[PDB]
Amino acid sequence: TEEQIAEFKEAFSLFDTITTKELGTVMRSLGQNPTEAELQDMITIDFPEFLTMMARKMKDTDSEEEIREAFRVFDKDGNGYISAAELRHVMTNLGEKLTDEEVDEMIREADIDGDGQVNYEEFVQMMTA
Amino acid sequence: NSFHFKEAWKHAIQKAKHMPDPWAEFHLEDIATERATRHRYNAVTGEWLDDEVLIKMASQPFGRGAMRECFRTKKLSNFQQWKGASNYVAKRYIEPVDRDVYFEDVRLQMEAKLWGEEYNRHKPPKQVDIMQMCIIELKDRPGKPLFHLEHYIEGKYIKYNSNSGFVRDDNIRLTPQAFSHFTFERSGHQLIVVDIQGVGDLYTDPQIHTETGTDFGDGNLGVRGMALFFYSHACNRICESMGLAPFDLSPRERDAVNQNTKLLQSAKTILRGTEEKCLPRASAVALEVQRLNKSILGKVHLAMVRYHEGGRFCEEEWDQESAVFHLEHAANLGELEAIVGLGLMYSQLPHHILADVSLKETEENKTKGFDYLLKAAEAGDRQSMILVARAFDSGQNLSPDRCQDWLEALHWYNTALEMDEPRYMMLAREAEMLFTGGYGLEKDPQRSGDLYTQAAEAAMEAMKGRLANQYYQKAEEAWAQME
Ligand SMILES: [Ca+2]
Ligand SMILES: [Ca+2]
Ligand SMILES: [Zn+2]
């Protein structure tokens, strides 16, 4: 996060300092598109604090992307659910020494609704905890 | 937190980040991107959802079966870097088919996926999963061609059974066969999921046999497919842990099936003790005979009979003995064809099903033949009704423990007429019987003349005018005795 800091600094300085309206202008001028949601969410604004908030956003979106990729690792058929068969196949194909009952237990732990599978909400809960 | 396996999840995640794209050297990313409409099916709701996807598909197929060819495809996730896009196999029928076949194939696979989840709910030693499959439509192409799409799975592909009796014996696995049999029982014999194949227990391209035999494409062999499965099926420890009643095979068929019992005992899948018992239905003729106290299982046994006769199970001469075994099982389960056939066979009479099979004459077989023929008559088989009328009339094929009874014979003649001998013939025979009386039936000149006139009219229908005149004369003669 360095040259990206330079890009953010140039984007802000184009508006130099900043207001809410200006915040939306700078977010759109950086390629983003903040809903009035995020606008009022924060919600004048300096540049250090703008860098902090943009860093927050980037971190949250990167974590969302990372967890979605992680889910794609196990949801072998992309139906939105990790079955026991899928997790077993993955653990085998990735060289892990988990037994079949261990795979069933991995699923059971994250199976909040009890359908024998792990949807994405349950997967995120397991990862964001 | 409450998860003592998060270390395992994350270890797998990073290991996967280090694994390479198995299709990298095919450079699907370099392919010109194409638009497609993805149609996906929800089998619980019976509802289709169509969205728009971008796919890169190989220009030439990498595989070709008898019916379909397969293209390596990458598809971008609507939920970026094409290099990391997910790998899919896209299948197309080589020969042009009706567009509805693709959607029916998706329905087949998604139904089988539901059945895999049902089997998993009974806590099996190894769980199964049928991979989702959807359709992509390439509308920007000539003729808006359709493709099946499934995720690519790395691993050793194995067909564990076919839709036609094949079972893999080299390192026999229990779970696929147990799953097929489970679907048979749990559906109440209404369907069976076969063609179990895939990587490990991730199945694909399954086939379903249904009683109607009308759905799920040209691979639905119906009760014939159920028969093909159960002819080869050896129940295993999983079948028993779930309460699956064995299929009633012949002693010879059971020996052939047991030829792999040592392999079954040496199989790798061991039970856990947590398995659960199977509206369901039993694959055994005993519990089904109680259930009946009209049967799909009887239709399966009858199909087995016809496959034995047709040489399907022939490896030497066709079994005949087992054909009769399954014909009897079908009969006791109420298949009218089987009851008629066994009544004719035990009565040493010409029969259609198992025609070249003659049973040894025994007096017990005479009683069995007439009993089966009377059952068939009471069930509405006209042929049997005429044979039973003739038996009560003349004694031909009558059970020795029964007596000629012209009242019963008249009953069955008239039941035949009210439903390859002409009708005027039976009407005139009733007329003769009432003209003389006998065997418990009293002379009835008036009714004899009435029936002779009915026979005369029926002869007139069949153009037999001179026979009609003889019958009118016989009616006049019957009435001339009165007064
Ligand atoms: Ca899945
Ligand atoms: Ca769940
Ligand atoms: Zn079985």
Residue B415, strand partner residues: none
Residue B196: what residue type?
Answer: I
Which pair of structure tokens corresponds to residue A1?
A: 């996060």
Greatest alpha-carbon span in chain B: 111
Starting from the CA of residue B133, give the closest ligand: 1
Enter the resolution in angstroms. 2.6
Task: Determine the distance from the C-alpha atom of residue A129 to the mean position of all C-alpha atoms in its chain, rounded to a whole number.
Answer: 14
CB contact at 8 A, B459 and B471: yes
CB contact at 8 A, B101 and B124: no
Query: Minimal CA–CA distance to B181: which of B249, B253, B243?
Result: B243
Question: B257 in contact with A at a CB cutoff of 8 Å?
Answer: no
Q: What is the rounded CA–CA span in Å between residue A87 and residue A107?
A: 8
Instruction: Determine whether the interchain pair B120/A78 forms a contact, defined as Cβ–Cβ distance below 8 Å.
Output: no
Which pair of structure tokens corresponds to residue B41?
A: 């099916």
**Distance from the A95 Cα atom to the nearest Cα atom in chain B, whole angstroms:** 8
Task: Determine the distance from the C-alpha atom of residue B233 to the mean position of all C-alpha atoms in its chain, rounded to a whole number.
Answer: 15
CATH number for the domain that contains residue A39: 1.10.238.10
Through-space distance between the first and last CA atoms of chain B, rounded to whole angstroms: 108
Residues A87, A52, single domain; the answer is no
**DSSP one-letter code for B30:** G
Residues from chain A that touch B150, judged by Cβ atoms under 8 A, are 77
Question: A83 in contact with B at a CB cutoff of 8 Å?
Answer: yes
Count of domains observed in chain A: 2
Question: A77 in contact with B at a CB cutoff of 8 Å?
Answer: yes
Residues A54, A69, single domain; the answer is no
Residues A56, A75, single domain; the answer is no
Q: What is the rounded CA–CA span in Å between residue B449 and residue A24?
A: 107
Question: A85 in contact with B at a CB cutoff of 8 Å?
Answer: yes
Instruction: Determine whether the interchain pair A72/B131 forms a contact, defined as Cβ–Cβ distance below 8 Å.
Output: no
Residues A85, A40, single domain; the answer is no
Q: What is the rounded CA–CA span in Å between residue B74 and residue B80?
A: 12
Total number of residues shown for chain B: 483
Question: B8 in contact with A at a CB cutoff of 8 Å?
Answer: yes
Starting from the CA of residue A109, give the closest ligand: 2
Residue B364: what residue type?
Answer: E
Task: Determine the distance from the C-alpha atom of residue A42 to the mean position of all C-alpha atoms in its chain, rounded to a whole number.
Answer: 19
Domain that holds residue A116: 61-129
Q: Which residue has the tokens 């003790």?
A: B273
Residues A44, A93, single domain; the answer is no
Residues from chain B that touch A88, judged by Cβ atoms under 8 A, are 126-127, 200-201
Question: Which fold does the domain B286-482 belong to in CATH?
Answer: 1.25.40
Residues from chain A that touch B154, judged by Cβ atoms under 8 A, are 93
**Distance from the A76 Cα atom to the nearest Cα atom in chain B, whole angstroms:** 7
Residues A79, A102, single domain; the answer is yes
B245: left (phi over 0), alpha (psi -120 to 50) or beta: beta
Residues A65, A124, single domain; the answer is yes
Residues A34, A97, single domain; the answer is no
Total number of residues shown for chain A: 129
Q: For residue B72, what is the enclosing H or E element?
A: strand B68-75
Residues A105, A55, single domain; the answer is no
Experimental approach taken:
X-ray
Residues A4, A56, single domain; the answer is yes
Residues A74, A41, single domain; the answer is no
CA of B265 to the centre of ligand 3 (A): 14
Residues A72, A120, single domain; the answer is yes
Question: A63 in contact with B at a CB cutoff of 8 Å?
Answer: no
CB contact at 8 A, B206 and B196: yes
Strand locations in B58-206, DSSP E?
A: 63-64, 68-75, 86-93, 129-130, 134-137, 146-151, 157-159, 191-194, 197-199, 202-203
CB contact at 8 A, A47 and A26: no
User: In 3-state terms, what secondary structure has residue B44?
Assistant: coil
CB contact at 8 A, B320 and B345: no
Task: Determine the distance from the C-alpha atom of residue B427 to the mean position of all C-alpha atoms in its chain, rounded to a whole number.
Answer: 42
CB contact at 8 A, B314 and B252: no
Question: B11 in contact with A at a CB cutoff of 8 Å?
Answer: yes
User: In 3-state terms, what secondary structure has residue A38?
Assistant: helix
Residue B310, strand partner residues: none
- Binding-site residue ranges of A: 16-17, 22, 44, 49, 75, 77, 79, 81, 86, 111, 113, 115, 117, 122
List, in order, residues 6 or more apart from A57 with CB less than 8 Å away.
none
Instruction: Determine whether the interchain pair A94/B15 forms a contact, defined as Cβ–Cβ distance below 8 Å.
Output: yes
